[PDB]
Design a protein around this ligand. Structure first.
Ligand SMILES: CCCCCCCCCCCCCCCC(=O)O
Ligand SMILES: *C(=O)CCCCCCCCCCCCC
Lengths: 55, 273, 238, 238, 55, 238, 55, 55, 55
């Protein structure tokens, strides 16, 4: 049982893990998740862009 | 026909109409579409000839040595360096310059060879040589000596090779900052129309650095590194006249005026003289 | 014995290769993961966070908090430039060591709009309006206010809202720009001017400071991973 | 460990090989493509475009626009040859540096009909008829008009339609011909003659010029990719 | 998931991409598209071969 | 990196190996095939075609058409031997250079029946009967007609049908015989005799000739491909 | 898509072409066609073995 | 016929035995069976933790 | 088309012949047929163990 993912472009590729340890697998170079909020905007009260930050 | 087949010859017979395939007017800028049958009785010919070897891809897809330098075991030049460019070799450069703009990925191949230098060192016993090629994109720290910290390559990409093994090789994406590599640039680098002029104002492909990792023997050894380019996944636009005058400089199109062609006796001589 | 045939590249060692390799610790039981605040997924998450820009590199100030201070004071005129630096998030000493700049310096290409947030640290009683402007390359850096206002600009009026933003729109002939310096990749000039001079009352300091924060926008990206020039050594540390 | 067995060729480096190889820039985001006018898919697209042939190689003229001029003038007779060159799109100095010829010189074999378009650049008042002919090999080049008309020909009459075409049908014993020279692969002789001499009125120049354009037909193809003799060097350019 | 194309002749071959980047794939040696028109014939008004180019 | 393990034979170069190898001419368009008369699929197709045997090796005759002539003439008795050679299609000088023999000499083993067709080239008026015989090994070659007729034979009577066939049935203890010489693989003796002497009329030549053709039958095969002893050299030809 | 043929004997084997050119394929060692007629017997009028060649 | 197991973690891998002898197979590194009883607690009469061992 | 046999033990293995000649195949190490009769007991009249060999 192989897997089949998408390559990087502007097609797919096949992968078969050969080792009993996950540590042996290739890198996870395609995790494109993003969550800036944790850093930019860690305010308790939501700040609405178009509004004044203070009133 | 067969995707890449060539047109078949349409059988024709005697004519006598007012249809004038043969008469046209080049002034239009239009190339005539005449075919044998238009000006002579032809037979029918099922043509199976393919134009497969004329595709932009097949034409530019062959490894080409674009440059090579050397670095030595010891002495003054212990490491090599080369500002990346396809214009120092004439072969590949003339092909690429068949088109104004071009886009392609590149298959890099390196041929690394060493030769023992003449010296007076007694009992030389070389160990197997291991080289290191390293690429430094514009803006990155450069090595000033064969043992500079820069060869750490925590981020710079670099290959480590050992004599005896197959040539090291690797693929490179289309690295342009624009939508296509430019082969020609009738412009300047400054808005005042000063500074640099020509193709070289766009070339900022960084530098390549080679060196040994070990000295190997007590004796002196010189190593040559040959860089080969092989365009893959090619797309080319706006064809232009092939280079006529020999190349003069690597960073511009400067040439020494040349005749249009070789000569011959008279406009009646069927011989190349 | 399955007939095989090695190809170029065989046995080499590319620093950026990506293959599978046997574990030296067969069946090792990793320590279970744990929820740790603030995980990071992409460096751009960081490049979107404001960091204080050192606009005042001038001489010895680089060795004090003063580097981060922008001098503003009441004058006997308006139009006076307040500062001016180029749009070289990667090269210019003004940005190069910023949060944004540090990241850019590990890459070769950059693209996207940039935000320059300006906080007025004068006193509650101090007032005034400034003209934050961005002039794309092509001509020179504007030398007079009347020439800077001809470009992309924001007339900031100081008031209860302390900070104001000058969004530097990514205008450029290419999709990406070089992080390193290059005139083809020229980015233009960012300058500030007095729109209507500072005006304090009596008993209120007439000389003030303005801080400048910089961060990337949601259309910012970076390409071609490389090493930073900013870190070096001569021997393995002991 | 899957039992394998390397075969001849293993580890070599063929210049024209075709294999997969690891990217040195993992996950690099290529610049998005763009619609650029005039894309090229096959070199034959170019070889189908007319280019001006330098029929007049004669001496020093190769260093002036004259190389592209075919002398025609009013005579005191007809039958006079106007020019004559062989069918060696690749070798003959007449074609070798043409758009068609340049391309052919990167290949070893060629096949197909060829078009020679002739534009009369005399004056509106100038008239005349010429006999464009192609004689397949086997005998010699025709030396008299009466011997050239025995072959494939087109009697061109100059008039409002400035240009006229002589389609050189691909007649040959083999499917392909050598781009280089070889008598087996002989291609025949292309000659022009006066059918009915040039006839201008008074006050109109009696000496004129005829240009010759060449291009490939839709049945033209090229094989066996090779290097051009036309480009050389002694050292890497600086 | 491999692919299967046709070889050049006057039979097929199997291909499996092994890398995560399309840049690593072999050349596209079989694109036989052709469009001479862009170059030969870039006239705004269609010129019919059998007709006179001017009248 | 798929765990692999090279086995013996790896990297070698067997002359008779059979593997795939990259083309040096990627996408080269082969010349379309053509219907050419007489295609050949197997060498046995050739070995089934008769070729004239040189039964008369005797001395200098090998350097003239006489080598292919079998002397027959009117005698004052019958029983006279006319010729006699062994069944060594590969070794015996009689066959070795034949169409059949040439082929056999590129192999090590052979098997099958063989046909010896005899054409009488005397004159229309000449007559007579001969005894074509094949004696399997084990005893000696028959020395008298009365001893040859004890074996496989055909009494040929000359007449309107010029030729006559002696089919040499493949009798042998093994399935195959060696093309080279070996007594284990002994093949027996082929001899001819006068059954009833030649009898011409007056004015008609009493001395005649008989030609001998040889070819393989439909049950003939050859094994173990080897090099011929019949071709040699000392240096690459110039 | 591999192929599967029969080996030589008195069992099968698997084959997968790896190159884009048919020229790269292994030899065609199993074409056992045969047509002696072209050579032995190229007569215009069929000659029946048991019959006389001339009459 | 290959097999497909799970790797060690906090994904699968494919395996195809290539030799005719089981001795040639890779190790059995994933047998997590456990039976302490044989050693700790080899008493004939079950001893209930919460109870007194003697009475 | 591969094959799948049983290994030797007290599991299976996969095999794919790669050559056009059966001679190239691995050994037939698992033919456990047995027929002692040809040698021990080549008598024309069946001899019943419990009986006397002669009477
Ligand atoms: C070890 C990593 C080596 C990486 C090799 C990188 C080479 C870059 C090649 C750029 C290609 C041809 C471009 C011409 C540039 C221009 O004139 O615009
Ligand atoms: C995607 O197609 C997965 C399906 C088949 C994958 C197998 C690749 C080839 C496996 C046979 C073993 C090859 C030994 C090279």
């Amino acid at each position: 049982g192989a897997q089949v993912s998408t390559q990087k472009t502007g097609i797919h590729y096949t992968n078969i893990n050969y080792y009993k340890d996950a540590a042996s697998n290739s890198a996870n170079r395609q995790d494109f998740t993003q969550d800036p909020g944790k850093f930019t905007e860690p305010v308790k009260d939501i700040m609405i862009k178009s509004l004044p930050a203070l009133n | 026909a067969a995707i890449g087949r060539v047109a078949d010859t349409v059988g024709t017979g005697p004519t006598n109409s007012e249809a004038i395939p043969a008469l046209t007017a080049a002034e239009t800028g239009h190339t005539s579409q005449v075919v044998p049958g238009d000006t002579m009785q032809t037979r029918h010919v099922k043509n199976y000839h393919s134009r497969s070897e004329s595709t932009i891809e097949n034409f530019l897809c062959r490894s080409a040595c674009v440059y090579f330098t050397e670095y030595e075991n010891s002495g003054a030049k212990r490491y090599a360096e080369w500002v990346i460019t396809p214009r120092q070799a004439a072969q590949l450069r003339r092909k690429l310059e068949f088109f104004t703009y071009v886009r392609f990925d590149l298959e890099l191949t390196f041929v690394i060879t060493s030769t023992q230098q003449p010296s007076t060192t007694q009992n030389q016993d070389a160990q197997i040589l291991t080289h290191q090629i390293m690429y430094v994109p514009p803006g990155g720290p450069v090595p000033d000596k064969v043992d500079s910290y820069v060869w750490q390559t925590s981020t710079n990409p670099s290959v480590f090779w050992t004599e005896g093994n197959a040539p090291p090789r690797m693929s490179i994406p289309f690295l342009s900052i624009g939508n296509a590599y430019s082969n020609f640039y009738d412009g300047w680098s400054e808005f005042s129309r000063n500074g640099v002029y020509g193709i070289n104002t766009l070339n900022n492909m960084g530098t390549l650095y080679a060196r040994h990792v070990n000295a190997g023997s007590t004796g002196p050894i010189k190593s040559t590194i040959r860089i080969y380019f092989k365009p893959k996944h090619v797309k080319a636009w706006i064809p232009r006249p092939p280079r006529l005058c020999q190349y003069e400089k690597a960073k511009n199109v400067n040439f020494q005026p040349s005749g249009v062609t070789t000569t011959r006796q008279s406009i009646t001589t069927m011989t190349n003289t | 014995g399955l007939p095989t045939m090695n190809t170029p590249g065989s046995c080499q060692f590319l620093t950026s290769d990506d293959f599978q390799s046997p574990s030296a610790m067969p069946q090792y039981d990793v320590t279970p993961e744990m929820r740790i605040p603030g995980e990071v997924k992409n460096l751009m998450e960081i490049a979107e966070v404001d960091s204080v820009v050192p606009v005042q590199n001038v001489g010895e100030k680089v060795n004090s908090m003063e580097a981060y201070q922008i001098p503003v004071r009441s004058n006997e005129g308006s139009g006076t430039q307040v500062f001016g630096f180029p749009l070289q998030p990667g090269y210019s000493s003004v940005f190069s060591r910023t949060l944004l700049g540090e990241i850019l310096n590990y890459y070769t290409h950059w693209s996207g709009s940039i935000k320059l947030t300006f906080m007025f640290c004068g006193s509650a009683m101090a007032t005034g309006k400034f003209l934050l402007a961005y002039s794309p390359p092509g001509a020179g850096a504007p030398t007079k206010r009347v020439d800077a206002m001809l470009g992309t600009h924001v007339v900031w009026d100081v008031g209860l809202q302390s900070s104001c933003v000058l969004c530097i729109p990514w205008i450029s002939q290419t999709h990406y720009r070089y992080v390193a310096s290059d005139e083809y990749t020229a980015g233009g000039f960012i300058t500030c001017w007095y729109q209507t001079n500072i005006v304090v009352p009596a008993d209120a300091q007439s000389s003030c400071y303005i801080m400048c924060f910089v961060s990337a926008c949601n259309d910012f990206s970076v390409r071609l991973l490389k090493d930073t020039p900013f870190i070096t050594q001569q021997n393995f540390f002991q």
